[PDB]
Amino acid sequence: KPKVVLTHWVHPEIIELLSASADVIPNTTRETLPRSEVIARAKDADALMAFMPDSIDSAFLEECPKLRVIGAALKGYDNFDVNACTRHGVWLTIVPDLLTIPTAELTIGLLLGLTRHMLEGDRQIRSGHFQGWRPTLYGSGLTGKTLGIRGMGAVGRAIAQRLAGFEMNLLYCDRIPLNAEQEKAWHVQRVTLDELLEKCDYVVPAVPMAAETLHLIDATALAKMKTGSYLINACRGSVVDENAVIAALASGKLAGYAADVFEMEEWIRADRPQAIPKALLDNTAQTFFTPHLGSAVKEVRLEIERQAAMNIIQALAGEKPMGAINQPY
Amino acid sequence: KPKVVLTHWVHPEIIELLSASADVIPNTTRETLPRSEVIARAKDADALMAFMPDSIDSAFLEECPKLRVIGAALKGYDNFDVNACTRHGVWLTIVPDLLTIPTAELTIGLLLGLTRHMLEGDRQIRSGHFQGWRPTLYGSGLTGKTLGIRGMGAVGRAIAQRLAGFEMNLLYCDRIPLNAEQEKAWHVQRVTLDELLEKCDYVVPAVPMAAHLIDATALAKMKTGSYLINACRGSVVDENAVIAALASGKLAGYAADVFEMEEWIRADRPQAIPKALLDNTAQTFFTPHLGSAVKEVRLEIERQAAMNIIQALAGEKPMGAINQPY
Amino acid sequence: KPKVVLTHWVHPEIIELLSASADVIPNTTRETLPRSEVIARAKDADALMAFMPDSIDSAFLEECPKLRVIGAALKGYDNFDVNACTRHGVWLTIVPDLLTIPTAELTIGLLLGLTRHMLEGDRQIRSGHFQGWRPTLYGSGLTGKTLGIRGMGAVGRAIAQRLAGFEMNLLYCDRIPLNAEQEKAWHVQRVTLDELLEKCDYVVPAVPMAAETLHLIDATALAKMKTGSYLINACRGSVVDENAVIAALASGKLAGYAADVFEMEEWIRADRPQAIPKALLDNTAQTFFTPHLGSAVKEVRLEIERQAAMNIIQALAGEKPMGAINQPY
Amino acid sequence: MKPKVVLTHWVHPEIIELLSASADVIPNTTRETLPRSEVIARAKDADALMAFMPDSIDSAFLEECPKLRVIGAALKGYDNFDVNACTRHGVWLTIVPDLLTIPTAELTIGLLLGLTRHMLEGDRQIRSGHFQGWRPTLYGSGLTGKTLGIRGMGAVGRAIAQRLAGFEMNLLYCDRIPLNAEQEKAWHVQRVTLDELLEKCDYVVPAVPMAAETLHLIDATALAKMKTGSYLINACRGSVVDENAVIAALASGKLAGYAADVFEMEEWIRADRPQAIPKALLDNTAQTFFTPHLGSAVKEVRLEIERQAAMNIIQALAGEKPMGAINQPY
């Protein structure tokens, strides 16, 4: 039987699925293995399941001569050298985008937890000193307030559909507008980009449709935003200039920052940080952070794992795998 | 099996990728097919891979009633009627912008080719009369010189990063400044447009971060003996003003990847590159819109359009969709 | 007034500088004079400014009995018989090496022009048939590629500094290593010559910190190189077997060859052709050549000329010139 | 106030005058090597040093001479220099290009002709005053038609083959790296193995090869493999030949003769070190021909080696990057 190496943990039913057609070498832990250990395992593997920490270059492939398929549990392939895979006769497969709904829900979670001081709230409970209602930790509510969705991609749409029932004033900007029937059913209003920053108490960058530049929220964008506004970034680490966010928090321009993603995650930028700035880390009163939990919901992780496993099983059986993005031989 | 028509040449690996789920009708040549021939192939097609010469308007869609997805191998959609596609139930997809880095490297190639007289050099070699060093083709060096990047969008930033090691005095103008870390990492100094034109030995127009051209009035503000390197777009430089400045000695050289005759979406337009420029082999260096003409990059643009097509035909929401059909 | 003969063209301010102390007989053309014409001019000369094409032997000196100084506008003296100058009472001076940076810059010029098909592109523009973008002239980019600098002398260091911002994988080999702070600043990694030849998309021979080797890029080296690789030679003609390179180009081993220097200009070995091979000259599609333009920038040529002229002015005034390599009489 | 430059060995007077323009020269007026203690004493307050092969520039040396800014080595290598220590002490360390190849080839051929033709015994017979015309004596071995193997096609081995090409011999060579097609034909040389070269050669000439540094290649085992009555010509370095094995092979008739320009007693920085040239070799004037490391001892070459070293020193003292620098100090 062929051997398949899984660089990260998967659900036991994925292992059983793969076990019928292959000998499985799992990662039994929740940790990322060092590259040398992944290679030591994959050196005589016929198949690999790759995750976000994996970096597949030709040096990797030269040390893994039996490899026939890399099934990535990922919707894109930034850290894969796809043509190297093709030249080495290695199928490279991805999965469809299943991150949209759990990312929209978590974004609403970061918004609520940050505006309502829920983390400082929890810390006060755990202190043992709670003695009843007090006039403290007064936050900012949603109803009557104006929230701006920068970009109406699939995530932006999923947020608008969910915030429609909260009796807010919902604005969005995008090069391409929503249909008329969706703007009415979500009570969301199309405006320009400078107007959205200007009127919004809450600014929520999603990925726009179409294209466009890097650091969508820089010092210039922050200066146009309303004083005492909140910025919630569950989109991409490149979207927000964290150091400008530090200065906007210090001067009172920003009331708070919530993020699920960080500039240190962008392995495409050379001008790249190696940690989350400690000024953000220290500011527990005004920040709410999560470690890229956007799609950390069991049912979605399972489905991403199953599609990657199905691609591997297909390729080992001799077929074109459903998620192939190349054609090797 | 569904039918995909490819209006322009693509790499054989992309054809194979699409062939696993569709029957592919490729353009086997390196030319643009006339619109009449494109429409005739796409008449009974389920998908189309479109390139820059494709003008997808209502008429085109009406001729192709089976179209379900148009996968543009492009970052923009100026030549596409998005609402028409939506009304005809056709997905319209684009690819992310992969042009920045090959364009910045070609800009530096043009700079070095022009300032070092490398084209006339190559022709002296091919002529067979080379017999060793001569006091000929003295050019202008980079070290110690002042270069201005007009606009600090993506291309402008990729140029500054690459020229940072050449020991020049680097300037830029843009309405939106860089942050302190970028300015100091790349040793680039922000100035006004007029200061840039006044101080610079080399002027490199780029796309600014957010939304003036090099005309006779701008050329008169430049330093006598300066060089202009245009790999941005054809509309940013007045070519007849540049001809005049090359003749008077205001400009020592002009290099371009882009030309006025490319600006289709504007009525005032020349049909060719001016003979005075084509003839000025000593002071010009030109490439035929080779900005992103690197195989690794073309392949990925093709692969992303192909993946967009494969997704739509299998009934998913394609990753590059910019509309919502039906 | 003493007479100074200049065998090659010089900038007019060099003529002006020398005229204060001597009558100047210049080469008004950009051509090399035949030896017999150089001698006929130098016959009554007290001084001579010499360049790379000049060849100063005892027979030459015997024909110029008033000569007191040869000011070589060169960093070396391979073409001068030093002790014949000494015996004839003639100062021989050189200039410092000023070639490093313009040579490094042109080397990158050659790399970009070759890999991006810029010569063919310019020809296509001049043919008059340009009608916009076409899927033509697809070349090889820099970013992500592996470039090896064989030899980390001065020119090699200047190349690595300049390529440091191009997001490549930079390798180098040398018996004398760079220091850690330079490998870090330039992101360049030391390897062996075999490692370099096997891993590199681009190979760039430079002068090592210290070694004695002639014809390092031969049929054996090209056999070890990656198929479809490019070779850029701005070093010296003896570094690359041009016949070996013709074969590697035909077989597909090399995608391209760019050179500023040629075997035909080597005058320290007799078995040398006196033309560039026709197979190279004809292959305009896969080669990019320049006629020894490595230091052909006005600012460097002028300073080379000024240092030679200052040496002449000093020696004529009875001083010991600053560039002297001998002691005459 | 002029910097001081110490020259540890004798140099031509032109080089001294060349240096004097920008420095005060402390020369070695003798043709002898000075003791290290005297070298160090002269160089203690020197700004510059011209080093030769006996000089051993270690941390102790640099710490004794704190004002040193440049060491100009009139040498092509740096085995005797602590390069990193020089760097850390802010001292340019410079070498000169290899200029020893052609004169070493010429000398090697001189040794071969002098040995095979008994020219030294012949000159002894002339000096005795007893010459009265031709005699059937000192019959030697000629070159034409014979087989000569060059063990190593480095620069010296290549210069020898080029010069022996007109002598109408059968030239063989061994080397882990071959010579490409063309040189092998212009010089009439054929690649063989080491064991085959030893077996077939009338004359064996070891040179330095390309790449592979193999040790002590000609010992008693290698001499046992050579053709009986062969001649051995060693002028590359003193480690490649076991001299006591040569004494034995000469006594047994395995070797007809041995010529050398280098000797084991020269190998200092290797533990294998006798102090003298074996008396059995010195007494054997009929079968040996020796020179005291004259491989590069031609006036025009020594002058140019010295000139380049001086120029390196002049450049560094002027604040320039010296042309032969192998380090970047400070």
**Which of C215, C223, C311, C317 minimizes the C-alpha distance to C269?**
C215
| Alpha-carbon distance values, B187 to A244, B183, C159 (Å) | 20, 6, 19
What are the chain B neighbours of C117 within 8 Å (beta carbons)? 290, 293
Catalytic residues of B: 233, 262, 289
Q: Closest to B293 (Cβ–Cβ): which among C138, C281, C301?
A: C138
| DSSP character string of D177-216 | S--HHHHHHHTTEEE--HHHHHHH-SEEEE---SS-----
Residues 6 or more apart whose CB falls under 8 angstroms from that of D122 comprise D138
- Which one of 3.10.20.30, 3.40.630.30, 3.30.390.50, 3.40.50.720 gives the CATH number of domain A1-96+295-329? 3.40.50.720
Question: 3-state class of A43 per DSSP?
Answer: coil
Nearest CA in chain D to C193: D211
Are C109 and B105 within 8 A, CB to CB? no
Across chain B, the runs of DSSP E, i.e. the strands, are 3-6, 23-25, 47-50, 69-72, 91-93, 146-150, 169-173, 188-190, 202-205, 226-230, 251-256, 284-286
Query: Is C292 marked active-site?
Result: yes
Compute the distance between CA of residue B277 and CA of residue B240 in angstroms, rounded to an integer.
9
Q: Give CA separation, D20 vs A58, C77, D15, D168, in Å.
A: 60, 21, 9, 51
Pull the structure tokens for residue D316.
């560094």
Superfamily of domain A97-294: NAD(P)-binding Rossmann-like Domain (3.40.50.720)
Rounded-to-integer distance, Cα B89 and Cα A251, Å:
50
Give the Cα-Cα-Cα angle C204, C210, C211 (nearest 5 degrees): 75
Q: Which residues of D touch C75 (CB under 8 A)?
A: 323
Breaks in chain C after residues (C–N exceeding 2.5 Å): none
DSSP letter, residue A208? P
D83 and C176 in contact by Cβ < 8 A? yes
State how far the Cα of A139 lies from the Cα of B38, in Å rounded to an integer.
Answer: 60
Q: Read off the DSSP letter of residue A144.
A: T
Quick check: B263 and B235 in contact, CB under 8 A? yes
Distance of alpha carbon B109 from alpha carbon C105, whole angstroms: 10
The answer to whether chain D touches chain A by having 3 or more C-beta pairs less than 8 angstroms apart is no
β strands within chain C, DSSP E: 3-6, 23-25, 47-50, 69-72, 91-93, 146-150, 169-173, 188-190, 202-205, 229-233, 254-259, 287-289
Nearest to A220 among B176, B316, B317 (CB): B176
User: CB C140 to CB B31 under 8 A?
Assistant: no
**Dihedral sign, Cα of residue D288, residue D294, residue D296, residue D301:** negative
Q: Cβ neighbours of residue A125 under 8 Å, at least 6 residues apart? A: none
Residue carrying the six token digits 């070639």: C99
> Residue D101: how many CA atoms within 13 Å on its side-chain side?
19
Burial (CB count <10 Å: 0-12, 13-18, 19+), residue D214 = exposed
Q: Is C285 exposed, middle or buried (0-12, 13-18, 19+ CB in 10 A)?
A: exposed
Which chain D positions have a beta carbon within 8 Å of C320's beta carbon?
21
Instruction: Looking at the complex, report in whole angstroms how far the Cα of residue C230 sits from the nearest Cα belonging to chain D.
Output: 22
Distance from C236 to chain D by nearest Cα, in Å?
Answer: 16
Which burial class, exposed, middle or buried, applies to C233 when counting CB atoms under 10 A from its CB (0-12, 13-18, 19+)?
A: buried
Tokens linked to B275: 């003979």
Q: What angle do CA B80, B85, B91 make, to 5 degrees?
A: 100
Specify the residue for token string 């429609």.
Answer: A164
Q: Nearest by CB to B298, which of C32, C138, C276?
A: C138
Residue C318, burial from CB neighbour count under 10 angstroms (0-12, 13-18, 19+)? exposed
Beta bridge partners of B80: B56
Interface test with C, best of B122, B127, B202, B264 (most C CBs within 10 A): B122
| Chain D CA closest to residue C244 | D180
Q: What distance in Å separates the CA atoms of residue B96 and residue A208, rounded to the nearest whole number?
A: 12
DSSP C239: G
CA–CA gap between residue A234 and residue B85 (Å, rounded): 31
Spell out the CATH class of D98-295. Answer: alpha beta
CB spacing of C297 vs B130 below 8 angstroms: no
Chains C and D, touching by 3 or more CB pairs within 8 angstroms? yes
**Nearest-CA residue of chain B relative to A321?**
B20
Residue type, A11: H
Q: What are phi and psi of B115, to 5 degrees?
A: -70, -25
Contact C171, C146 (CB under 8 A): yes
Distance to chain C for B11, nearest Cα, Å: 10
Residue C81 CB contacts under 8 Å (≥ 6 apart), including other chains: C56, C57, C58, C61
Task: Give ∠ CA C178-C183-C188 in degrees, rounded to 5.
Answer: 105
- Give catalytic residues of A, as residue numbers: 236, 265, 292
Checking phi first, is residue D75 left (phi over 0); if not, alpha (psi -120 to 50) or beta?
A: beta
Q: Does domain B97-291 have CATH number 3.40.50.300?
A: no
**Separation between Cα atoms, residue C203 and residue B298, nearest integer Å:** 24
What is the distance between the alpha carbons of residues A107 and A89, in angstroms, rounded to a whole number?
40
Method used to determine the 3D structure: X-ray
**Burial group, residue A195, by CB count within 10 angstroms (0-12, 13-18, 19+):** middle
3-class DSSP state of A67: coil
Pick the CATH number of B1-96+292-326 from 3.40.50.150, 3.40.50.1100, 3.60.15.10, 3.40.50.720: 3.40.50.720
Spot the catalytic one: C8, C68, C150, C236.
Answer: C236
- Could you state, in order of their start, the residue ranges of all structural domains in chain C? 1-96+295-329, 97-294
- B17 vs A270: CB contact, 8 Å cut-off? no
Query: From the list C86, C212, C320, which residue is nearest D14 (CB)?
Result: C86
Assign domain D1-97+296-330 to its CATH superfamily: NAD(P)-binding Rossmann-like Domain (3.40.50.720)
Among A91, A24, A78, smallest CA distance to A52 is for A78
For residue C315, give both structure tokens: 């020696």
Q: Residue D229 has which token pair? A: 């009555």
Q: H-helix or E-strand containing D94?
A: strand D92-94
Measure the CA angle with vertex C179, ends C177 and C182; round to 5°.
115
